[PDB]
Amino acid sequence: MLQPKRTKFRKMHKGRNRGLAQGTDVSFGSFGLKAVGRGRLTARQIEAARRAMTRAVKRQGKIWIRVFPDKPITEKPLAVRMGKGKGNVEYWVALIQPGKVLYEMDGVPEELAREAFKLAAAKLPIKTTFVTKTVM
């Protein structure tokens, strides 16, 4: 479960998630799972997808996680009246814009990479596609 070791501040504003993403190319490995929809990726979701990939490939090849959940999300408990302070931090998300290469993989044939990325795309909450490294 990914989380920053320390941050300057514990709570952040909600903010907005407009625009299209940077880091949209396959940079290190040969194949990539790229997000086409827009949303948030919980650290639990990222972990579940990574576990599914690594188990599908059986620990050959190399896997890069190109996103990191650095934004804390708060929640209020039940039976708490609205308005008495910002709530407590519960989990961390990574905001995703379209075209954002979430995961990336090398050292494995294309069909096995496609199958592993299919299992992880089934674990993720947003729309994805499979992309290949292109020379320029």
- Using CB under 8 A, list all residues that contact other proteins: 80, 84-85
Closer of 20 and 80 to other proteins (Cβ): 80
User: Residue 111 CB, nearest distance to RNA (Å)?
Assistant: 26
Question: Which token pair is 62?
Answer: 């190399």
Which of 33, 41, 57, 67 touches RNA (CB under 7 A)? 67
Under a CB-based contact definition with an 8 Å cutoff, are residues 57 and 45 in contact? no
Stretch that binds RNA, among 12-20, 47-55, 117-125, 127-135 (CB under 7 A): 12-20
Q: Is the CB of residue 12 less than 8 Å from the CB of residue 74?
A: no
- In 3D space, the residue among 2, 23, 29, 30 whose CA is nearest the CA of residue 100 turns out to be 23
Whether the CB-CB separation of 33 and 106 falls below 8 Å is answered with: no
The Cβ-side half-sphere exposure at 33, using a 13 Å CA radius, reads 29
* The binder of RNA chosen from 56, 65, 95, 112 (CB under 7 A): 95
* In the complex, minimum distance from the CB of residue 6 to other proteins, in angstroms, rounded to a whole number: 20
User: Is residue 127 close enough to count as binding RNA by CB under 7 A?
Assistant: no
Question: Per the structure block, which two tokens stand in for 38?
Answer: 């827009």
Q: Which is nearest to 119 in space by CA: 99, 105, 100, 98?
A: 105
User: Which of these ranges, 41-49, 62-70, 110-118, 119-127, lies near RNA under the rule CB under 7 A?
Assistant: 62-70
Q: Which residues bind RNA (CB under 7 A)?
A: 6, 8-23, 27-28, 38, 66-68, 70-71, 73-77, 82-87, 95
